[PDB]
Structure formats: C-alpha cells, structure tokens
Amino acid sequence: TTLLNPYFGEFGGMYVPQILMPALNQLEEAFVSAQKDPEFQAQFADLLKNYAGRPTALTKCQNITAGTRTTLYLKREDLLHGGAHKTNQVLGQALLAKRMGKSEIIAETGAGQHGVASALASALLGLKCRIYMGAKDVERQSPNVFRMRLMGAEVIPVHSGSATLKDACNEALRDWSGSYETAHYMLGTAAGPHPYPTIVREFQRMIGEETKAQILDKEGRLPDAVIACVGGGSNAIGMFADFINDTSVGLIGVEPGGHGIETGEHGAPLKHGRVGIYFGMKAPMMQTADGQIEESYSISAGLDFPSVGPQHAYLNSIGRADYVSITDDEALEAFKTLCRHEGIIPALESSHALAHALKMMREQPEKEQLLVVNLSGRGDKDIFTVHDILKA
Amino acid sequence: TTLLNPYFGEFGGMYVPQILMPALNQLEEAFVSAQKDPEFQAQFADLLKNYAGRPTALTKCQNITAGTRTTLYLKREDLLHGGAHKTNQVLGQALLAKRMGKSEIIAETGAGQHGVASALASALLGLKCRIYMGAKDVERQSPNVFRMRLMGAEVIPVHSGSATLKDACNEALRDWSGSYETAHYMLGTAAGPHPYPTIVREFQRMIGEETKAQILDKEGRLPDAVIACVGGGSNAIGMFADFINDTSVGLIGVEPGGHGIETGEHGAPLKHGRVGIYFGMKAPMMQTADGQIEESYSISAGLDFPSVGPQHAYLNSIGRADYVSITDDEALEAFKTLCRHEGIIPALESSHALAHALKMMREQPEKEQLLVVNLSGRGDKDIFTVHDILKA
Amino acid sequence: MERYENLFAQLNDRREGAFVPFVTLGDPGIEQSLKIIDTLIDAGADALELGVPFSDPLADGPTIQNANLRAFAAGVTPAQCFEMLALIREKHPTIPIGLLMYANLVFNNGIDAFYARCEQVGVDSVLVADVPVEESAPFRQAALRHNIAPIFICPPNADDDLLRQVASYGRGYTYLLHHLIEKLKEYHAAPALQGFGISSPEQVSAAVRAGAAGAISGSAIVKIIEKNLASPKQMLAELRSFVSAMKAASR
Amino acid sequence: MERYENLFAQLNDRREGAFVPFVTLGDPGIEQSLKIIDTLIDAGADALELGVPFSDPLADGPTIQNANLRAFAAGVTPAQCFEMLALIREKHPTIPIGLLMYANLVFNNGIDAFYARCEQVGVDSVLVADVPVEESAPFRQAALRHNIAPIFICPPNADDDLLRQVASYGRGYTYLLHHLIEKLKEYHAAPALQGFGISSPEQVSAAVRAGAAGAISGSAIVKIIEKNLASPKQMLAELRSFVSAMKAASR
C-alpha cells in the first residue's frame, strides 16, 4: 500500500524489483512527513533564498515582441545558483536524505547538469555524493565532470548498454537497491517510480508559484499561456503545477524535435513514442517496435531522457496541457534571437520553449496574448556548440 | 571647472587631451542630473531587479568556518546576470548614454567580462556596441569573444603596444575623442579620468547597501570587515562605499600577488607600484624606473589592470582602508576550498578575496570576527585553468 | 500443464532438491545457446530459467549485462528467443521452463498476448524482474489464464505482509534470495528455491538442509560461458562438469 | 632663451610662415634619426617638434604608434632621447626645439626636474599631450621657471573660455588643430601654428593665408620614414624633397 496515489491516470506506478519497494515506501513516508513539517519548509526556503538566490526574476522582453500584440515574460531560472532549475529539487531531496538519517547521495546524469547540482547540494549539506554517468557522456562533458569532482563528488563512468543517460539510470538503481539504508538516490527529473514524480514536482513548484504572483503584480492577470521545454519534465511541471487549477491558463510542453519528427531522429516520446514500462514507471517511451529502449536525440544534450514524466502524459490525455515539438534549427534560431535582442544567453534546452513562443507570436502577429516562457537555464555551456554549427 | 571634485586627495584628476574635456564635462553633468532624477533611478532599479536579478543573496558559509570563531558571509554577485558584478554599472552607464541621446557604446576589455557586460547591456537597451580588445587577449578569450559577437557587439582587436588591456584602453579613448557626440565610452572600472571613478562607484554601491541591510537583518550588527579583490577597483569600492562612514567596519582590498611580490611578477600597484599619470588619472602604476607602463600579472586574467582606482589610493593613504595581496597558489587553494565545502565555484578574481578571509581565520582560529567577502563573480570560466594547473 | 508440480513431487519421492541453472537465450549465439541448454539438461538440470535479452536490465549485475551484450551482438531478438523456446520444448517434454523477463517486453504488444505466446511454445513460468507484487495483478492474472506460473521474488528485507502476498500470488516456485522458509510453508507458498550466490555444490546442499526445495544458480553458468568464449567445445565441457557437480549435491 | 620669439620676428620681416615637422626621436634608430633631423633642418625646417617614445601614446594615431614601436625596437629610452636633444642643440644654435611628451614621462622623476633637464639640453618648448589646461598649473609653472615655453592645443570644439586660457597660459606658439585665429590674436595668444592634416604644400599656404603664423606636419614626415625603411638613403632624399616643398609654400 502507499500514502499517495502512485498513478496519474494510467501512467506512473512503481515498477521496480521487489527488493527496492521498501526504499520507495520509506521515501514516500519521509516526504509526506517533511511536507507537513514547518521546520523542514523553513530550512528549505532558507536555502532556496539565501543560497540558491530565490525568488528568481520574471523578465519582460520588449525587444523580442516589438511590432506584435504578444507580451512575453521569461521566468529566469537561468539566474539560479548552478545556472539551471535543477538546483531547486536537489536541495529539497538532500534535506530529505538528511531527514532520513542518510549520509550518502547517489545520482545519475547525462548532460552533466544534474550531476553538478547533486554534487553542489551534497557538498553544501555534508553528503558523500557518488554520481553515475554514461561513458559516452563523460567524454562529451569533460567540463561538468571536472566540476563535480571539484565539488568532491565521485564520478563513476557507465560503459554498459549504449553508455548514455538510460544506462546510467540503471546502474544507480542497482547501487541503491543494495545501499538505500545509508544512501539516497537523488533522481534528476519528474519521472521514475513513485514517489519521485510527485516529489520533484513539489520541490520545483515554487517556479510556478513565483510566476503567478509576479505576473499578477506586473500585469494584474494570469498569463494566457506558460511554456516550458520537456526533457524529463521537471522544469515544465514545476512551472505548470500552480496553474493546473487555472483553466484559462494554457500549459504548453515542448519536446525536442531533433532533425525532424519524420526523420525519426528526435526526442519527443510523449507525442511520438509508445507507452511502455521502464525506469520504474508506465509512460510513453522511445522504443523499437520490439520493445527495446532507444535513445532520445536532440541538439541539446539535456533533453536526452528517452521518456517523460507520468503526470505530463496524464495532463496530455485529459487535454489539460498541450505538447508540441521544436527542431534543432528552430531552437538554434531562438537561441540567436535572445542573445541579440535581450542580451540573455539561453540554454539550448530552454531555447526550445522560447522558439515555440516565437512561433505563437510570428504566425499570428496581431493576436493579443500574454506569454511566459520558463527559461530553465543559461546557455554559456552551449556557446561552442552553436559556434561550430554556424561555422560549419 | 567641474561640478564634483575630480580628486580624492592627490589621486585622480582628468588627464586627457584637451579635445576630450568637453566629453568628460558633458558626462559629469548628465550624471549629476541623472542622480537627482527619480525617473532615472526608478528605471535603473527596475533593470537591476527585473533583469539583473538584484538584490543578490548574502550567503553564510558554515562549513568553511567550522572549528573557528570566524563567521563568514559571501555577497553573491556571482549570481548576478552575466556572472559578475560588472553588470550593475554597465546598466547605469547605458541609461546615461541614452539620457545624453547617444546611440553608440564604446568599451575596452581584457579578460572579456566587461566586453560581455557592455554587449549585453547594449543589446538590451538598443545600443550599437563596438568593443576594443587586445590581440593577445582575443586569442586567449575565444569564448567571451563569441559571446560578445553573439550579442551583436562588434569586436575590434588591438595589436598596438603589448596588445593587452592597457593598449585596448588607449584605442577606445582615441575612438571616443572623435565620436563622443553620438558615442559613449563605457569604461569598465572605478578608474580613468573623472567622472568615471565617481560614476562607477555610485553604480556599484548597491552592493554595499544591500550587504549592510542583509547583515543587519541576519546578525543584528555591522561586519567587523568587508573584503574584496582589487583589479581596477569597481567591485571593491562598490562594497566599501556604504561602509566608509562606519569607522568600526574594516575595509580590506586585495591585490593579486601573482607568483609573489618579491618576484616582480604581480599586479599590486597600489602597495607595490609607483604613482604616475596614465589612462587619464594620477594613481599608483605598474611601471619601469623609466616611466613606461608595464603589465599586471596574475593567474586570474581579470585582475590585469596595471593601475588602481584613485579613491582606493586615497582611502589607503588616510588609513581608512587596508590593502594586501594574495598569490596565485593562495587564490587557487581558496578556489578549491569553496568548491568542496560550500558547493560554489568562485571566479579566480574573487578567490583572492576569499583567500585573504581564510588567512584571517586560520592564523587566529580563536579570534571572534564577522567577515563578509564580496564574491564578485562565478568561476565556471576558470574551470580549465584550475584543471591544467592541478594536472601539470 | 503441471510440470513444476510433477517435478517437485518426483524430487520429494527421491528426497532430493532441485537444481536450476539460468542462462540468457542467444548467448553467445543461437546455435551455441541451444547446445548449451541441451548440455545443461543432459548434465542434470531439473528445470531452466531463461532470460530474454533486454536493452536496459536495470535489475541485473555485470555478468548478466555482458550476456545481453553478447546476445545482442548476435542479433538475438525476443521473436528468435521464442523460436528457441519452441525448439527446446519439442526436444524436452517434461522439464519445467521458466522465463526471466523485464516488464516492457511483456507489456510491449499486450500482456495477455505475451502469456498466450508462452503457453503456445510450452513455457511453464514467468518472473517479471521489475514488477513487484503490488503491480502484478495484470501479470499474474494473464499468466493464470494461460496456465503459466507467475513467479515472485521473496527478498531478504521482506516482512510478514510480503510473505503472505508472495504465498497466495505465486505459482510453481518461490524465488528466494530459516524463518522465511518456515513461514512460506506456513502460508502454503509454492516450493522455495534458494537463489543468489548459488555457485558451488556445498551451497546447494546447504539450501536443501535449510528446508528449501532446491537452488537456482543465478549467474555461475553465465560466468563459465564468458570465460570459454574462444573454445565452444571446452565451454560445453565445463558447463557439464559444473552442472553435474551442482546436481549431485542436491541428492 | 627667446628662440621662438626671434624666429617669428625673422619670419614676419620676410612675410613668410613657419613650417614645423614632427618626428619621433630614435625612429628607426638613433643614428638614422640624427641624420633625419639634420636633413629636415637642411631642407628648411623652421623649428622642430620631437616626440619621446612612450609605452601608451593614447593621444596618437596609427602612424605615430608604429614610430614608437620602431623606436622601442631599437631600444630608445628617454635618457637617450635627451642625449640626442643635446647633440642636436650643439649643432644648431637658433632653431626652436619643441618636445611632444606624455605626462607620466614628465612626472616620473619630478615635473620640475624634467623641465630643468630640458633647459640644460637646450629645449625651447614642451607640449604635454595628455595634460589639459585645467591640469596644467604644475607643468606650465615648472616650464616657466626653466625658460621653457608651455605649449597648448587649441582644439576645434574649443569655446571662448578655453581660448582665453590657452592665450594666457601658452608660450612660444599655440598648437591649433578664421574665427579661432582672430580671437587668439585678440587675446594676445602666442603665434598660432596650424596642425593636423598638414601634408601638402597647398595646406601650408592656406594656413598662412588664414592668418596662422605657420603649419605643423603632425605625421607626414613619419609616413615618409616608414615607407623607406629598407633604404636609409632614399629616405633622407624624399624627406628633403617634401620638406623643401612644404617650406617653399610658406614664403
């Protein structure tokens, strides 16, 4: 049995080997307890404010919308300590681990951002952090790898399978099934087995709560739509959450279209995948007609999760949220546009969300609309990538 | 004649070719006017808050001081948009340029940070920005160079002289003496000819004002000392300013000691240079016994200004502020220490300030003291530098 | 069919435990795999536990992961595995055949269809590695409708409530990883098979003495395979030695 | 001494303007430089404006910057420049010699000491490129105490107040970059010398017709030098042609 519903419609659940159930149950319970603990909330709020730099700003982008009836605002998670939204939830999970009396943290990362976040959180809260990362990802993310080590985290390469994020995710679970007594698995997205999808949303919902209050203060009304990129689904759900009950507010999730949907080279399983059971959950997957799990492709390394959060799949099925895709080129253009007209270098991940907002504006220049794009992170890391492409 | 005193004791002045005086006078006047203009202040505050992310946090670092009677706080300018404090003043200078009816910006940069800041400000406020940078610095700062261009700024290499920051500073003045009617020279530090030293301090003083209120809120009293690195003197004076009248508050500026003072390979002209007249001001300089201007050396590229702000030289002469130096190795160690114990990657520039605070703590473990280090910027840019060194 | 029921009854009348080896279908190749399995059986295996190569076996250790890699290298697919399962059953009518699967492969084209296919080829049981008892309803139900025994793992960190569920939900045999054994018998759970670490004769006899109905060698067999890759013949020889040694210890 | 006063008086009695060329001391080398200067004088230069190589000539254009680079390449130092200044004066007793300096080089070892050294070698004037009239007090005072004429630049964007200061503060000649000229004479300013762009004979005659007492070729001379680096002899020849041409236009 459980305390909270493990399912969002037909999606979600706890599909892990029996040996891991006790870990999930203990975790859910500590979470339920911490959510009612004022002391826990105060400590979490303190770190978010005095360490991470919350609340983050909500920037109005006038140059970008000039000549149209579109008003665009960007939730500045790129200004959060670490350069991305991931810092919010890792801070909460670490306090959770401490509440459970755990002294060790286990994490998985592909692009490296989650690894860096887990490492900085562990260093700050005195936790021994060991991070699993796919061999192919290590080679490609030398910078983030040195950052993790620089912060005292142990980086462990994963050569098994395709040696990417999914393969790293498996090695973490393996380690955890045998050490959850002293170690806490700090999953990096609103996915995986319950209670992770629920826990990550709650530890990222301040994004949406701040956005509502901020837009209410500057515009005196809720936005017509909030837009966020969807890799695993953490920044998107974090933005959506507080708006779910606001029916007039459109929720738009953006999956990477890669080289194009019809090319098969993309990372949009929610709208172009097929439901399966993997990584401890029932959700749409990038898989062969056979049932083998495939990789998620995108110019942005961070949208490599070959699946998507359960709640997004659910929100989509009931029509509460809409999911679309943006290609590498569309993201690149949005990336160049923001640099030139607002002086902000967006992460190529976040650039997918911006690109969609730009399309909503451009296709219907005379449509009046108040939009908010969740700028999940900064793009200083993508400088060379955008360079070689424009150079080649 | 002038509106404000161009001198701080014997230091400062306006040593520029006659042809440029009108530009300085016009600038001073527009500044005096803008400082009394509530509308200007509101617009500046709005950008600092909703665009740059102010106020920045003040982080207490408990892990670093464990086992000692030292309490350390870090003013998080590393969390400011752009990753460094430089963003504060470039925003004000750009509004100043607009107030004067100018549509163009001229800037000089060595490490590239000021170039990036000028570029982002110009892009945001619709200004045509052209940046001068030393050829040697271009080669070494490929990333920041692409960032500036990415933000629409024109990057112009300077091969004359030693092809570094000082040589770039000369080319800018040359350009400005002939185009100040439509262009504004956005100097990057609390130095140069009046009114720049005064203007940059005022546009960076929110650092100290926020720090006072924040420490007052968390500790109920002013710090025993505020510590900042000193390259040109902008982040340091920005932190000091609001504390100058608080006699009980020690002000400590930290110059780069490079490989060591006695080696002659450093960048500490304030305490180890000789007063001269260069870059439009009377201030201590890095120069030969002959009077030729030399370069400033430091592991951190950003502390390459071969001189120092006039007000610092003055504050030092009257004993109000104390200036010391920190070597490459001391800065490196402080850099490694912060990463491991607080999960914050500091800029190698800021690391000099931290290193000094660490020394104040370590040498006298039982001395009770409330310290504040101005973490002027993030060190993501220094990752490889600290890598190759620890690797070699 | 009642292959497990018949096997255990026969083993009880001979006061001996069952020895069950595990191997990945198609490792290192279809043909060599079919030869391995026939060798395991001729050496004295009482039943088999066969695994189907899956892309992300998040519930397996290094040894098995490499087995999947080797299998995929030979282009082994679930469809081929089922072709093998059929060939194996045709040659051996009474040996219990259990499959070790991962949820997605079972759910992929319909849970019910999967179990219908198992029944058609002659499979006796299925253990879905990543489906805890709390999520098994759809699986065990489908398994029962097609006369397939839904196998469940009884972990060490198990509690009384789990023992009760495993006891009423499982069939064929309980995959065990003194008190646990007695309790499982108290709840009329399927005969327990000691797993994990089973790689030497003395472990088999120890399992039987503790009250288990047998032992399962989770990866020892796979290990012998990867070490004799360069010599297919020596591989079959060593497999035959290890298995007869292990089986002998159950008597 | 009153070299400028005597020169202008002599030029007025001959109804002609003065032609003043500028060159960097030590460019491209000490010896070649001394030969250049003697050639400039033999070609008809009325006075000289000599620059001392400075590390950061933030008030000079490309041409001159390269001249400093060439000079530094030959190891030219301020001390050597002063050795040259002495040699030049010893050979030429009446030609006015003005120096174009940068503040630090003058302030380096004491402003007063610098002007004392100028007087000793026979220098007639000093124009500190980066010292506006507002900051000149210490400089012009030191210059006067050592019989050195403090020269000031009268820019185009100058206003009446500036004209009045330049007029009472300057000596020898006003470095000008119709109304300005008349006003300078109204305030009894030192004779004005048209500078900037002066590179052709017709510019010299135009300056004299406008009411200026002469012209200063700010960089034309330097240009001829850098283009004939490979041929020291052809360099002196062209310099001699240009200078006699320019001088002739002032008559």
Ligand SMILES: *Cc1c(COP(=O)(O)O)cnc(C)c1O
């Ligand atoms: C990691 C990352 C993402 C993808 O993760 P979600 O869980 O989908 O939010 C998106 N944006 C940025 C900047 C990231 O670093």
Ligand SMILES: *Cc1c(COP(=O)(O)O)cnc(C)c1O
């Ligand atoms: C540019 C820089 C400095 C040096 O400039 P000051 O004018 O001395 O403040 C210091 N810290 C950081 C992070 C910088 O980027």
Ligand code: NA
């Ligand atoms: Na995804």
Ligand code: NA
């Ligand atoms: Na300096």
